[PDB]
Amino acid sequence: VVIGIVNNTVYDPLQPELDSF
Amino acid sequence: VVIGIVNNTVYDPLQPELDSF
Ligand SMILES: *[C@@H]1O[C@H](CO)[C@@H](O[C@@H]2O[C@H](CO)[C@@H](O)[C@H](O)[C@H]2NC(C)=O)[C@H](O)[C@H]1NC(C)=O
Ligand SMILES: *[C@@H]1O[C@H](CO)[C@@H](O[C@@H]2O[C@H](CO)[C@@H](O)[C@H](O)[C@H]2NC(C)=O)[C@H](O)[C@H]1NC(C)=O
Ligand SMILES: *[C@@H]1O[C@H](CO)[C@@H](O)[C@H](O)[C@H]1NC(C)=O
Ligand SMILES: *[C@@H]1O[C@H](CO)[C@@H](O)[C@H](O)[C@H]1NC(C)=O
């Protein structure tokens, strides 16, 4: 529904921590 | 690079929970 959008990967800080657990 | 700085243990809220898990 948004116009002029782009694609890029946002980083979750919890994701590397929980993956390291 | 900052001036007038001090040292204190800033606290992650994830760290106790993930360490308990
Ligand atoms: C941004 O990401 C979306 C989601 O991956 C892309 O949409 C998909 O594009 C592929 C390739 O054309 C299609 O096979 C999928 O069916 C599309 N999905 C949807 C929900 O439309 C989109 O093309 C990407 N845009 C850019 C500019 O990279
Ligand atoms: C604040 O903390 C930093 C990091 O531990 C201290 O810097 C270290 O101090 C020791 C002791 O003099 C040195 O052996 C290290 O080489 C220092 N490390 C760095 C990266 O500089 C700093 O002294 C502390 N400051 C105060 C006021 O407590
Ligand atoms: C910017 O304008 C061009 C046409 O010159 C168009 O193709 C493009 O989709 C526009 N992009 C945005 C973000 O408005
Ligand atoms: C405050 O002033 C004193 C001199 O009166 C100086 O020695 C000290 O480093 C200064 N501290 C800060 C944080 O500016």
Side-chain angles (χ1 to χ4, degrees):
Chain A
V1 75
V2 175
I3 61 175
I5 199 149
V6 303
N7 294 6
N8 183 256
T9 48
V10 319
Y11 169 95
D12 282 319
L14 176 61
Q15 178 79 55
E17 296 302 336
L18 186 55
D19 289 341
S20 73
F21 184 87
Chain B
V1 72
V2 174
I3 55 177
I5 201 146
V6 301
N7 293 14
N8 182 254
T9 49
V10 314
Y11 196 91
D12 290 325
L14 177 59
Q15 187 83 333
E17 190 65 14
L18 189 60
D19 287 351
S20 72
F21 188 76

Short mmCIF file of all heavy atoms in Angstrom, two decimals:
data_model
loop_
_atom_site.label_atom_id
_atom_site.label_comp_id
_atom_site.label_asym_id
_atom_site.label_seq_id
_atom_site.Cartn_x
_atom_site.Cartn_y
_atom_site.Cartn_z
N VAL A 1 0.80 -1.22 0.00
CA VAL A 1 0.00 0.00 0.00
C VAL A 1 0.84 1.28 0.00
O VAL A 1 0.31 2.35 -0.31
CB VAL A 1 -0.97 -0.04 1.20
CG1 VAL A 1 -0.24 0.23 2.51
CG2 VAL A 1 -2.12 0.96 1.01
N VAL A 2 2.13 1.20 0.37
CA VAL A 2 3.06 2.32 0.35
C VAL A 2 3.70 2.43 -1.03
O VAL A 2 3.89 1.43 -1.72
CB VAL A 2 4.13 2.13 1.45
CG1 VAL A 2 5.18 3.21 1.39
CG2 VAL A 2 3.48 2.11 2.83
N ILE A 3 4.04 3.65 -1.45
CA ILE A 3 4.61 3.90 -2.77
C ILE A 3 5.97 4.58 -2.63
O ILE A 3 6.19 5.38 -1.72
CB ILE A 3 3.64 4.72 -3.66
CG1 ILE A 3 3.32 6.10 -3.08
CG2 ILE A 3 2.37 3.92 -3.93
CD1 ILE A 3 2.46 6.95 -4.02
N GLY A 4 6.87 4.24 -3.55
CA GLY A 4 8.28 4.61 -3.50
C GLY A 4 9.13 3.74 -2.60
O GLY A 4 10.27 4.10 -2.30
N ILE A 5 8.59 2.60 -2.16
CA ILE A 5 9.25 1.68 -1.24
C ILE A 5 10.49 1.03 -1.86
O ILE A 5 10.68 1.02 -3.08
CB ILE A 5 8.22 0.65 -0.79
CG1 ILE A 5 8.65 -0.05 0.48
CG2 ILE A 5 7.92 -0.35 -1.91
CD1 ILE A 5 7.48 -0.46 1.31
N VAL A 6 11.34 0.48 -0.99
CA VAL A 6 12.55 -0.25 -1.37
C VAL A 6 12.66 -1.51 -0.51
O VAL A 6 11.97 -1.65 0.51
CB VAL A 6 13.84 0.59 -1.23
CG1 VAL A 6 13.75 1.86 -2.07
CG2 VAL A 6 14.11 0.93 0.22
N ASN A 7 13.52 -2.44 -0.93
CA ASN A 7 13.77 -3.68 -0.20
C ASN A 7 15.18 -3.69 0.38
O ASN A 7 16.16 -3.52 -0.35
CB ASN A 7 13.61 -4.91 -1.10
CG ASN A 7 12.19 -5.14 -1.58
OD1 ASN A 7 11.29 -4.32 -1.36
ND2 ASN A 7 11.98 -6.28 -2.25
N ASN A 8 15.28 -3.88 1.70
CA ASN A 8 16.56 -4.06 2.39
C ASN A 8 16.29 -4.87 3.65
O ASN A 8 15.17 -4.90 4.16
CB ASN A 8 17.23 -2.72 2.71
CG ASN A 8 18.58 -2.89 3.36
OD1 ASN A 8 18.73 -2.71 4.57
ND2 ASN A 8 19.59 -3.26 2.57
N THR A 9 17.33 -5.55 4.15
CA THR A 9 17.19 -6.42 5.32
C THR A 9 17.39 -5.65 6.62
O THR A 9 18.50 -5.18 6.90
CB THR A 9 18.17 -7.59 5.24
OG1 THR A 9 19.48 -7.12 4.92
CG2 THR A 9 17.72 -8.61 4.20
N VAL A 10 16.33 -5.54 7.43
CA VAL A 10 16.44 -5.01 8.79
C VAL A 10 17.03 -6.08 9.71
O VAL A 10 16.82 -7.29 9.51
CB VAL A 10 15.08 -4.50 9.31
CG1 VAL A 10 14.34 -3.74 8.22
CG2 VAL A 10 14.22 -5.62 9.86
N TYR A 11 17.77 -5.64 10.72
CA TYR A 11 18.45 -6.51 11.68
C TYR A 11 17.71 -6.51 13.02
O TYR A 11 17.55 -5.45 13.63
CB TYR A 11 19.89 -6.02 11.81
CG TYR A 11 20.77 -6.57 12.91
CD1 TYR A 11 21.61 -7.64 12.68
CD2 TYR A 11 20.78 -5.98 14.16
CE1 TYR A 11 22.43 -8.12 13.67
CE2 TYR A 11 21.59 -6.46 15.17
CZ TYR A 11 22.42 -7.52 14.92
OH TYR A 11 23.26 -7.98 15.91
N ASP A 12 17.27 -7.69 13.46
CA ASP A 12 16.80 -7.88 14.83
C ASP A 12 17.98 -8.12 15.78
O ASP A 12 18.77 -9.03 15.54
CB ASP A 12 15.85 -9.07 14.92
CG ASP A 12 14.46 -8.74 14.41
OD1 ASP A 12 13.95 -7.64 14.71
OD2 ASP A 12 13.86 -9.59 13.72
N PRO A 13 18.13 -7.33 16.84
CA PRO A 13 19.22 -7.60 17.78
C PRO A 13 19.05 -8.89 18.56
O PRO A 13 20.04 -9.57 18.86
CB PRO A 13 19.20 -6.37 18.71
CG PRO A 13 17.80 -5.88 18.64
CD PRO A 13 17.34 -6.15 17.24
N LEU A 14 17.81 -9.27 18.88
CA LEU A 14 17.55 -10.54 19.57
C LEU A 14 17.96 -11.75 18.74
O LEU A 14 18.29 -12.80 19.30
CB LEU A 14 16.07 -10.61 19.94
CG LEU A 14 15.52 -11.88 20.59
CD1 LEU A 14 16.20 -12.18 21.92
CD2 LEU A 14 14.01 -11.74 20.81
N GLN A 15 17.94 -11.63 17.41
CA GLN A 15 18.15 -12.81 16.57
C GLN A 15 19.56 -13.39 16.71
O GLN A 15 19.67 -14.61 16.96
CB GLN A 15 17.79 -12.47 15.12
CG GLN A 15 18.01 -13.59 14.09
CD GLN A 15 16.91 -14.64 14.11
OE1 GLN A 15 15.73 -14.31 13.96
NE2 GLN A 15 17.29 -15.90 14.26
N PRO A 16 20.65 -12.63 16.58
CA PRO A 16 21.97 -13.20 16.89
C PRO A 16 22.16 -13.65 18.33
O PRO A 16 22.83 -14.67 18.55
CB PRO A 16 22.93 -12.05 16.54
CG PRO A 16 22.22 -11.28 15.51
CD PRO A 16 20.78 -11.30 15.95
N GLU A 17 21.60 -12.95 19.31
CA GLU A 17 21.74 -13.41 20.69
C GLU A 17 21.08 -14.76 20.90
O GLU A 17 21.72 -15.70 21.39
CB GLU A 17 21.13 -12.38 21.65
CG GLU A 17 21.82 -11.02 21.66
CD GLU A 17 23.30 -11.12 22.01
OE1 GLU A 17 23.69 -12.10 22.68
OE2 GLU A 17 24.06 -10.21 21.63
N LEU A 18 19.81 -14.89 20.52
CA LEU A 18 19.12 -16.17 20.69
C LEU A 18 19.73 -17.26 19.82
O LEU A 18 19.79 -18.43 20.23
CB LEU A 18 17.63 -15.99 20.40
CG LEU A 18 16.73 -17.20 20.66
CD1 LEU A 18 16.87 -17.70 22.09
CD2 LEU A 18 15.27 -16.83 20.39
N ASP A 19 20.21 -16.91 18.62
CA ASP A 19 20.95 -17.89 17.81
C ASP A 19 22.28 -18.29 18.45
O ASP A 19 22.71 -19.44 18.28
CB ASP A 19 21.22 -17.33 16.41
CG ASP A 19 19.97 -17.26 15.56
OD1 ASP A 19 18.98 -17.95 15.89
OD2 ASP A 19 19.97 -16.52 14.56
N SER A 20 22.93 -17.39 19.18
CA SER A 20 24.14 -17.78 19.90
C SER A 20 23.81 -18.64 21.11
O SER A 20 24.62 -19.47 21.53
CB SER A 20 24.93 -16.54 20.31
OG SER A 20 24.30 -15.86 21.38
N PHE A 21 22.63 -18.45 21.69
CA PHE A 21 22.05 -19.45 22.58
C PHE A 21 21.44 -20.59 21.77
O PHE A 21 22.05 -21.65 21.62
CB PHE A 21 20.99 -18.83 23.49
CG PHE A 21 20.42 -19.79 24.49
CD1 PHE A 21 21.04 -19.98 25.72
CD2 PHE A 21 19.28 -20.52 24.20
CE1 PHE A 21 20.52 -20.87 26.64
CE2 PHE A 21 18.76 -21.42 25.12
CZ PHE A 21 19.38 -21.59 26.34
N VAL B 1 36.45 9.57 23.04
CA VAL B 1 36.25 10.87 22.42
C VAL B 1 35.40 11.82 23.25
O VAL B 1 35.50 13.04 23.07
CB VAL B 1 35.65 10.66 21.01
CG1 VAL B 1 34.20 10.22 21.09
CG2 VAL B 1 35.79 11.91 20.15
N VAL B 2 34.55 11.30 24.14
CA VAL B 2 33.70 12.12 25.01
C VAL B 2 34.49 12.54 26.25
O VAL B 2 35.41 11.83 26.69
CB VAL B 2 32.44 11.33 25.40
CG1 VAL B 2 31.60 12.08 26.41
CG2 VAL B 2 31.60 11.01 24.16
N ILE B 3 34.16 13.70 26.81
CA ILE B 3 34.86 14.24 27.97
C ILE B 3 33.89 14.44 29.13
O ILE B 3 32.73 14.84 28.92
CB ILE B 3 35.62 15.53 27.63
CG1 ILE B 3 34.71 16.60 27.00
CG2 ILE B 3 36.80 15.22 26.71
CD1 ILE B 3 35.44 17.92 26.72
N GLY B 4 34.37 14.18 30.34
CA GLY B 4 33.56 14.09 31.55
C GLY B 4 32.88 12.76 31.77
O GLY B 4 31.99 12.67 32.61
N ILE B 5 33.29 11.73 31.03
CA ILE B 5 32.66 10.41 31.09
C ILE B 5 32.92 9.71 32.42
O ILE B 5 33.89 9.99 33.14
CB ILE B 5 33.17 9.59 29.89
CG1 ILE B 5 32.22 8.45 29.57
CG2 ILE B 5 34.59 9.09 30.13
CD1 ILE B 5 32.17 8.16 28.10
N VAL B 6 32.03 8.77 32.76
CA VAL B 6 32.11 7.95 33.97
C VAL B 6 31.82 6.49 33.62
O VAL B 6 31.30 6.19 32.55
CB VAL B 6 31.14 8.43 35.08
CG1 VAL B 6 31.43 9.87 35.46
CG2 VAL B 6 29.69 8.26 34.65
N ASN B 7 32.15 5.59 34.55
CA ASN B 7 32.01 4.15 34.36
C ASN B 7 30.94 3.58 35.28
O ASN B 7 31.05 3.71 36.51
CB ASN B 7 33.34 3.42 34.62
CG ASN B 7 34.42 3.74 33.61
OD1 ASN B 7 34.32 4.68 32.83
ND2 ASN B 7 35.49 2.92 33.62
N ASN B 8 29.92 2.95 34.70
CA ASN B 8 28.90 2.25 35.48
C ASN B 8 28.31 1.13 34.63
O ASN B 8 28.30 1.20 33.40
CB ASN B 8 27.81 3.21 35.95
CG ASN B 8 26.75 2.52 36.80
OD1 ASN B 8 25.63 2.29 36.34
ND2 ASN B 8 27.11 2.17 38.03
N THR B 9 27.81 0.09 35.30
CA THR B 9 27.33 -1.13 34.64
C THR B 9 25.91 -0.97 34.09
O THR B 9 24.92 -1.27 34.76
CB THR B 9 27.40 -2.32 35.60
OG1 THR B 9 26.81 -1.97 36.86
CG2 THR B 9 28.84 -2.76 35.83
N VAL B 10 25.81 -0.50 32.85
CA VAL B 10 24.52 -0.44 32.16
C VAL B 10 23.99 -1.85 31.91
O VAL B 10 24.75 -2.78 31.63
CB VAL B 10 24.63 0.36 30.85
CG1 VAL B 10 25.41 1.66 31.08
CG2 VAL B 10 25.30 -0.46 29.77
N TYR B 11 22.67 -2.00 32.01
CA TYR B 11 22.01 -3.29 32.24
C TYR B 11 21.14 -3.69 31.05
O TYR B 11 20.19 -2.97 30.70
CB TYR B 11 21.18 -3.17 33.51
CG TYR B 11 20.73 -4.45 34.15
CD1 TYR B 11 21.50 -5.07 35.12
CD2 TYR B 11 19.51 -5.01 33.82
CE1 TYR B 11 21.09 -6.24 35.71
CE2 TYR B 11 19.08 -6.18 34.41
CZ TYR B 11 19.87 -6.78 35.37
OH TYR B 11 19.43 -7.93 35.99
N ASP B 12 21.46 -4.84 30.43
CA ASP B 12 20.60 -5.45 29.40
C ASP B 12 19.43 -6.18 30.05
O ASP B 12 19.64 -7.02 30.92
CB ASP B 12 21.38 -6.43 28.54
CG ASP B 12 22.39 -5.74 27.63
OD1 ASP B 12 22.10 -4.62 27.16
OD2 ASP B 12 23.46 -6.33 27.39
N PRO B 13 18.18 -5.89 29.65
CA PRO B 13 17.06 -6.67 30.19
C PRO B 13 16.98 -8.08 29.63
O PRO B 13 16.45 -8.98 30.29
CB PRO B 13 15.84 -5.83 29.80
CG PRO B 13 16.25 -5.13 28.56
CD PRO B 13 17.73 -4.85 28.72
N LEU B 14 17.50 -8.30 28.42
CA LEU B 14 17.56 -9.64 27.84
C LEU B 14 18.53 -10.55 28.58
O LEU B 14 18.29 -11.76 28.67
CB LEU B 14 17.95 -9.53 26.36
CG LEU B 14 18.13 -10.83 25.56
CD1 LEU B 14 16.86 -11.66 25.55
CD2 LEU B 14 18.56 -10.50 24.14
N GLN B 15 19.63 -10.01 29.10
CA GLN B 15 20.72 -10.85 29.58
C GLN B 15 20.33 -11.74 30.75
O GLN B 15 20.66 -12.94 30.73
CB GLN B 15 21.94 -9.97 29.89
CG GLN B 15 23.21 -10.73 30.26
CD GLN B 15 23.99 -11.20 29.03
OE1 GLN B 15 23.41 -11.42 27.97
NE2 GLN B 15 25.30 -11.35 29.18
N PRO B 16 19.64 -11.25 31.79
CA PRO B 16 19.16 -12.18 32.83
C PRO B 16 18.19 -13.23 32.32
O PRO B 16 18.31 -14.40 32.71
CB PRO B 16 18.47 -11.24 33.84
CG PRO B 16 19.09 -9.92 33.63
CD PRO B 16 19.36 -9.85 32.15
N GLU B 17 17.25 -12.86 31.46
CA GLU B 17 16.27 -13.82 30.98
C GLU B 17 16.93 -14.89 30.11
O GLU B 17 16.73 -16.09 30.32
CB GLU B 17 15.17 -13.10 30.21
CG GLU B 17 13.97 -13.97 29.86
CD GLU B 17 13.21 -14.45 31.09
OE1 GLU B 17 13.43 -13.90 32.19
OE2 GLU B 17 12.39 -15.38 30.95
N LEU B 18 17.72 -14.47 29.12
CA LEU B 18 18.41 -15.44 28.27
C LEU B 18 19.38 -16.30 29.07
O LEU B 18 19.52 -17.50 28.80
CB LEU B 18 19.11 -14.71 27.13
CG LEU B 18 19.71 -15.57 26.01
CD1 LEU B 18 18.64 -16.41 25.33
CD2 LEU B 18 20.40 -14.68 24.98
N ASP B 19 20.06 -15.72 30.07
CA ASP B 19 20.91 -16.53 30.95
C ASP B 19 20.11 -17.48 31.82
O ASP B 19 20.62 -18.55 32.19
CB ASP B 19 21.77 -15.63 31.84
CG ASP B 19 22.90 -14.96 31.09
OD1 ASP B 19 23.12 -15.30 29.90
OD2 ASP B 19 23.58 -14.09 31.68
N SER B 20 18.87 -17.14 32.17
CA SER B 20 18.02 -18.08 32.89
C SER B 20 17.49 -19.16 31.97
O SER B 20 17.33 -20.31 32.38
CB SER B 20 16.87 -17.34 33.58
OG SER B 20 15.91 -16.90 32.63
N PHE B 21 17.23 -18.80 30.72
CA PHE B 21 16.86 -19.73 29.66
C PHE B 21 18.09 -20.37 29.03
O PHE B 21 18.72 -21.25 29.62
CB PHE B 21 16.04 -18.97 28.61
CG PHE B 21 15.43 -19.85 27.55
CD1 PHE B 21 14.30 -20.60 27.83
CD2 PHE B 21 15.97 -19.89 26.28
CE1 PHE B 21 13.73 -21.40 26.84
CE2 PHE B 21 15.41 -20.69 25.30
CZ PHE B 21 14.29 -21.44 25.58
C1 LIG C 1 10.71 -6.72 -2.79
O1 LIG C 1 10.37 -7.98 -2.13
C2 LIG C 1 9.16 -8.62 -2.57
C3 LIG C 1 8.99 -9.87 -1.74
O2 LIG C 1 10.03 -10.81 -1.99
C4 LIG C 1 9.23 -8.88 -4.07
O3 LIG C 1 8.00 -9.46 -4.51
C5 LIG C 1 8.17 -10.79 -5.07
O4 LIG C 1 8.94 -10.77 -6.28
C6 LIG C 1 9.15 -12.07 -6.86
C7 LIG C 1 10.00 -11.87 -8.10
O5 LIG C 1 9.35 -11.04 -9.05
C8 LIG C 1 7.81 -12.76 -7.15
O6 LIG C 1 8.06 -14.09 -7.57
C9 LIG C 1 6.93 -12.77 -5.91
O7 LIG C 1 5.64 -13.28 -6.25
C10 LIG C 1 6.79 -11.35 -5.36
N1 LIG C 1 5.97 -11.36 -4.15
C11 LIG C 1 4.98 -10.50 -3.93
C12 LIG C 1 4.25 -10.66 -2.62
O8 LIG C 1 4.67 -9.63 -4.74
C13 LIG C 1 9.49 -7.58 -4.81
O9 LIG C 1 9.59 -7.83 -6.21
C14 LIG C 1 10.77 -6.93 -4.31
N2 LIG C 1 11.00 -5.66 -4.99
C15 LIG C 1 12.21 -5.21 -5.33
C16 LIG C 1 12.24 -3.87 -6.02
O10 LIG C 1 13.23 -5.84 -5.08
C1 LIG C 2 36.63 2.99 32.73
O1 LIG C 2 36.72 1.68 32.10
C2 LIG C 2 37.79 1.52 31.15
C3 LIG C 2 37.67 0.12 30.58
O2 LIG C 2 37.93 -0.88 31.56
C4 LIG C 2 39.13 1.79 31.83
O3 LIG C 2 40.17 1.70 30.86
C5 LIG C 2 41.17 0.70 31.18
O4 LIG C 2 41.87 1.03 32.39
C6 LIG C 2 42.85 0.07 32.79
C7 LIG C 2 43.42 0.52 34.11
O5 LIG C 2 44.09 1.77 33.99
C8 LIG C 2 43.91 -0.08 31.69
O6 LIG C 2 44.81 -1.13 32.05
C9 LIG C 2 43.25 -0.40 30.36
O7 LIG C 2 44.24 -0.40 29.33
C10 LIG C 2 42.17 0.62 30.03
N1 LIG C 2 41.49 0.25 28.79
C11 LIG C 2 41.19 1.12 27.82
C12 LIG C 2 40.50 0.55 26.61
O8 LIG C 2 41.47 2.31 27.91
C13 LIG C 2 39.13 3.18 32.46
O9 LIG C 2 40.35 3.39 33.14
C14 LIG C 2 37.96 3.34 33.43
N2 LIG C 2 37.92 4.70 33.94
C15 LIG C 2 37.53 5.01 35.18
C16 LIG C 2 37.56 6.47 35.53
O10 LIG C 2 37.18 4.16 35.99
C1 LIG C 3 10.40 8.75 -9.69
O1 LIG C 3 10.06 9.19 -11.01
C2 LIG C 3 10.26 8.20 -12.04
C3 LIG C 3 9.93 8.84 -13.36
O2 LIG C 3 10.86 9.87 -13.68
C4 LIG C 3 9.41 6.97 -11.73
O3 LIG C 3 9.66 5.96 -12.70
C5 LIG C 3 9.72 6.44 -10.34
O4 LIG C 3 8.83 5.36 -10.04
C6 LIG C 3 9.56 7.54 -9.30
N1 LIG C 3 9.95 7.06 -7.99
C7 LIG C 3 9.40 7.49 -6.85
C8 LIG C 3 9.96 6.91 -5.59
O5 LIG C 3 8.50 8.32 -6.84
C1 LIG C 4 35.91 19.81 36.72
O1 LIG C 4 36.85 20.85 37.14
C2 LIG C 4 38.05 20.39 37.78
C3 LIG C 4 38.84 21.61 38.19
O2 LIG C 4 38.16 22.35 39.19
C4 LIG C 4 38.80 19.47 36.82
O3 LIG C 4 39.98 18.99 37.45
C5 LIG C 4 37.91 18.31 36.41
O4 LIG C 4 38.60 17.49 35.48
C6 LIG C 4 36.62 18.82 35.78
N1 LIG C 4 35.73 17.70 35.49
C7 LIG C 4 34.89 17.68 34.46
C8 LIG C 4 34.04 16.45 34.34
O5 LIG C 4 34.81 18.61 33.66
#
